[PDB]
Each structure stands twice: as structure tokens, then as C-alpha cells.
Write a protein that binds this ligand. Structure first.
Ligand code: U1
Ligand code: U1
Ligand code: U1
Ligand code: U1
Ligand code: U1
Ligand code: U1
Ligand code: U1
Ligand code: U1
Length: 517
């Protein structure tokens, strides 16, 4: 943390953050979500990290070079250490990226290595080559070299993500799935795991072996798994929570804005809220049905009437303010809702649905006040506007993500937040073979457009192909865009160091501090 001159620090430097749900895991290769990543940044540090405003910055690597954007060489700081006092080396990264690529690990982020185009990754994911053929090597203990199959000018931006953090081989090998328990875990971030009570709390304590430990101010942070946004706000206002999770409740937000304006942080956020359609399950494999659901949803009502938290109505998957996004707003978004409703009803009748035989399906969401209230409003709107019947189902976060990967659903509430600020951080998740494709969308034309983005050496041509890829997704109605999120949360006045400037919201508790109050 960088404490400003004259700030008086509190005697006790402890922090309580709500984290939205129980984490899937603490293993960097087994996670895919925001809650998971929130805890992961405090425990495991990759090559680069985000600074307090979100800029890619030195992590374990203190400096790096690239040759033609294809060979990237990272110089690891000599004092980087794990919490057991042993050095973090380039060998740790070689093992870790291999474990990520290895199909036996079944990481949800195995494709992150395809997004960066690390040599031989396609064959490794397919089982054609062993994970040891991955295009990474330790040139010495403090030098990690990555070789890509084509120039990727933004490659380094990918490296602040948890999937490319190191994991301790000896703990993984000796303890297997229990390597993340407090007694067994080894970590190289600013914190160490002290306690993990499932569905109660995760408690982290400062790691004295962290290379930049002298700048760490918070001594202990607790992450809570509260999925009720109303409850989160309640325990923040009671004094227990210092920073809520950034999912705000419809019940109280209007009131909070007027009651505690200075505590309500509302900043840009590169995330899109949408209804994910299972594209491989009839009748959702018919474009007419998917298009009807997309058009009959009234975003103005959801965004401005039912939620009204500053969100913008969405017409694409990639947020239009992503660095590199130059998207074409489709004609259907400019129409009136009445015109969208007629078009929707017309495609539905063409797909064989009648009043006698209506379209009935499930709408899966993860437990939450926000998601439930939004799903109830969406069910009503689709019933009223299009004649479809929806059966709402809630699941806890970890189960919900597994259900979407399994494909055991019809429509699911969904939200993707950028991992790096560039349109492919969204677009690559819709590739046919992406480990993150929970839409189960497979379009050879979409795949080709993205493939072509690294075959040109022009950002103008790249941006045009990204727009065309969004247009292909849209013409196929792969998803139902709802709104672009804003990052809205409550932060006590005494919590210093949270700028709200990073649109990826990659917060590190090592950057924060408690002002005397
Ligand atoms: U004190
Ligand atoms: U106190
Ligand atoms: U650049
Ligand atoms: U940029
Ligand atoms: U269903
Ligand atoms: U509620
Ligand atoms: U460039
Ligand atoms: U106090």
C-alpha cells in the first residue's frame, strides 16, 4: 500500500470483505469466478499483477522483454519467496502452466493458454501431446521464457489472471485435493491462509515471506460468503463488513444512495450481464427461438425501472468500452419494444409454438436477491411479451457453474467480466473449443473471424474483425445481452487505497489500509 502523507493509520489493521459466495476452490487451476479470483490475488502471485489503478505491473517478474511479440522473457526477482521461506523460481511457473494445460487437471481455464497462444497448447488439450511439450521453459531459476505460435502484442496483459499464477508442486503432490487446507497450503502472495470455514469465512493473514511485505499494511482480511446482497448491506451498516461484494440489492439501493452517498462507490466495470442459452439443447438450437427471447426481453424496463443502478442496456457480449472495442449497434436495439415484441412473436410462431403448445423452459440462476428479482421480472416480461412460461431454479454458486459446464440446463443467468482489457478476453470464450464456453455455441464462421485477428498486424483490422465477430454472435442469437455492469459497492470511509479506477476490479488487499476512525 502507498499511504499518503499525513494520513493517520488505525491501530488495528484488519479488514472484512463480503465475497458474494462460497469459493469453488482455492486452487488457481480449479477456479473460474470473481469470488474465487478475489481470494486468489491475495494468496498467489503471477509474473505480473495489476497496480492500484489496474495497470499491468511487475509481480514475481521484475522486468520482461519480447521478441516479435512471440518469445517473451520474464526476469524473476531474486527475493520472491513462498510462505514456507523457499524461493519462487521459473521452475514453479513451468510446472504450473503445464498443470493448467494438462487435461487431467480439467481446469475451467485450460483455454487461457490458447487465448495467449502458447506453443503446442491445442495438441496438449486434445491429449495428442504431453503437457511437458508446452511452450514454456526455465532458462535458469530466475528466468521464465514463453514461446507463442504467433505474435500477441497484448500477451503480457493476460498474466495478472489466477490461472497463470504458480502453485507449489510439493504440496499438490503430497496432499492432492487437500493441498489448499490451512495446514498444507503454501502461498506466494501478500497473505497466507489462516482459516477456511466453508459457508462461514475465509481468514487471510499477512505473509512475512512476501517480497514486498514491508509495504503491506492490512494484517488480516476476512472474506465472507454471503450471497444475499440485502444481508451484505445489512452487515456492512451494522459495522461488521468494511467493503460489500459488488452486487447491489434492489430492495435497498435507492435508499442507500440518499442515505450514505460518500460510501456508495459506482465505477466503470468491464462485465456483461446476460441470459446464457444452451445452444446445443433443443429447442434452443433453433435460432428463431433464441432470437425471440433476445428481442422480447425489455432492457429499458429491467435496466431503468426494475434495477435502476446505473447499468447500460446491452446489445453485445463484449462491453463497448473495452479497450479495442469499436462495436456496431444492431438495428434491433434501436427499434421500439413493441416492434421487437412483434418480431419475436413472429419467429416463435414460425418455430412451432402456439397458445395450445407454448414454449416452456427453465431459468437457472445462482442464489441471490438481485438475480432472483431480475429473473422474476424477466419471467413476467417474457410471459407478457412473448407468451413463454419459465420455471425459475436457484443453485449455489459452485453448483451453478458446474451445471452450466455440464450443459444440464435451458437458459441460465450469466455474467462475464474481462480477465484482461482487450475484446478477445470476452470473444475467446465463445470459440467452439473454449474451456469457458458454457453457451455451448460452436460457429466455424465465428471461430475463423477470431483466428484472423492475429493474422493481421493492424489494430484497425483487428477491431473490425472483433466487431464482425460480435455481429456473427448476434446474428446467431447465441446469448441474450441484458446490461453492462457498473461496479457498485459500499466502502467504509476509513478504507483507504480503493480507487475504483481499475475497470477489471483486480483488488489486492496488500494495497489497502485502515484510516484511524
Ligand atoms: U487503540
Ligand atoms: U477502537
Ligand atoms: U501497443
Ligand atoms: U490501450
Ligand atoms: U427444462
Ligand atoms: U429479498
Ligand atoms: U500495436
Ligand atoms: U473508534
Amino acid at each position: 500500500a502507498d499511504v499518503p502523507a499525513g494520513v493517520q493509520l488505525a491501530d488495528k489493521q484488519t479488514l472484512v470483505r463480503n465475497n458474494g459466495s462460497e469459493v469453488q476452490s482455492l486452487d488457481p487451476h480449479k477456479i473460474e469466478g470473481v469470488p474465487e479470483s478475489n481470494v486468489s490475488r491475495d494468496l498467489f502471485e503471477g509474473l505480473l499483477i495489476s497496480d492500484v489503478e489496474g495497470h499491468p505491473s511487475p509481480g514475481v517478474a521484475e522486468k520482461w522483454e519480447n521478441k516479435d511479440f512471440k518469445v517473451w522473457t520474464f526476469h524473476l526477482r531474486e527475493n520472491a519467496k513462498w510462505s514456507d521461506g523457499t524461493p519462487v523460481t521459473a521452475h514453479d511457473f513451468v510446472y504450473s502452466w503445464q498443470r493448467l494445460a494438462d487435461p487431467n487437471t480439467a481446469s475451467p481455464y485450460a483455454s487461457y493458454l490458447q487465448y495467449g497462444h502458447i506453443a503446442n497448447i491445442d495438441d496438449i488439450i486434445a491429449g495428442k501431446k504431453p503437457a511437458t511439450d508446452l511452450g514454456v521453459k526455465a532458462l535458469d531459476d530466475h528466468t521464465f521464457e514463453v514461446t507463442l505460435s504467433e505474435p500477441v502484442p497484448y500477451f503480457y496483459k493476460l498474466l495478472v489472471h489466477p490461472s497463470v499464477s504458480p502453485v507449489p508442486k510439493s504440496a499438490v503432490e503430497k496432499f492432492g485435493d487437500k493441498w489448499t487446507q490451512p495446514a498444507n497450503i503454501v502461498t506466494n502472495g501478500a497473505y497466507k491462509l489462516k482459516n477456511w470455514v466453508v459457508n462461514e469465512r475465509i481468514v487471510l493473514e499477512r505473509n512475512p515471506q512476501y517480497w514486498d511485505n514491508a509495504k503491506t499494511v492490512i494484517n488480516q482480511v476476512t472474506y465472507l460468503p454471503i450471497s444475499s446482497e440485502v444481508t451484505d448491506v445489512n452487515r456492512y451498516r451494522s459495522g461488521e463488513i468494511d467493503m460489500t461484494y459488488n452486487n447491489m440489492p434492489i430492495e435497498l439501493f435507492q435508499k442507500l444512495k440518499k442515505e450514505i452517498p460518500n460510501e456508495v462507490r459506482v465505477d466503470p466495470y468491464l462485465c456483461t450481464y446476460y441470459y446464457e442459452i444452451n445452444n446445443q439443447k433443443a429447442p434452443f438450437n433453433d435460432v428463431r427461438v433464441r432470437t425471440a427471447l433476445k428481442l422480447a426481453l425489455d432492457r429499458d424496463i429491467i435496466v431503468n425501472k426494475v434495477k435502476n443502478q446505473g447499468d447500460l442496456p446491452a446489445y453485445s457480449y463484449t462491453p463497448p468500452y473495452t479497450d479495442g472495442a469499436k462495436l456496431v449497434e444492431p438495428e434491433w436495439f434501436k427499434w421500439s419494444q413493441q416492434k421487437r415484441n412483434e418480431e419475436a412473436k413472429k419467429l416463435l410462431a414460425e418455430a412451432g409454438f402456439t397458445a395450445d403448445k407454448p414454449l416452456t423452459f427453465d431459468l437457472l440462476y445462482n442464489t441471490s436477491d438481485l438475480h432472483k428479482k431480475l429473473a422474476i421480472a424477466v419471467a413476467s416480461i417474457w410471459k407478457k411479451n412473448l407468451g413463454v412460461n419459465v420455471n425459475l431454479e436457484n443453485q449455489e454458486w459452485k453448483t451453478f457453474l458446474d451445471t452450466r459446464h455440464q450443459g444440464t440446463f435451458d437458459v441460465a443467468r450469466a455474467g462475464w467480466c474481462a480477465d484482461y482489457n482487450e475484446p478477445t478476453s470476452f470473444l475467446n470464450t465463445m470459440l467452439s473449443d473454449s474451456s469457458n464456453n458454457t453457451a455451448h455455441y460452436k460457429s466455424p464462421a465465428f471461430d475463423k473471424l477470431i483466428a484472423d485477428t492475429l493474422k493481421v498486424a493492424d489494430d484497425t483490422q483487428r477491431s473490425e474483425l472483433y466487431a464482425k465477430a460480435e455481429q456473427q454472435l448476434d446474428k446467431d442469437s447465441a446469448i441474450v445481452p441484458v446490461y453492462y455492469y457498473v461496479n457498485a459497492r459500499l466502502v467504509k470511509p476509513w478504507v483507504g487505497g480503493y480507487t475504483g479506477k481499475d475497470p477489471l476490479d483486480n483488488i489486492y488487499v496488500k494495497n489497502l489500509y485502515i484510516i484511524k476512525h
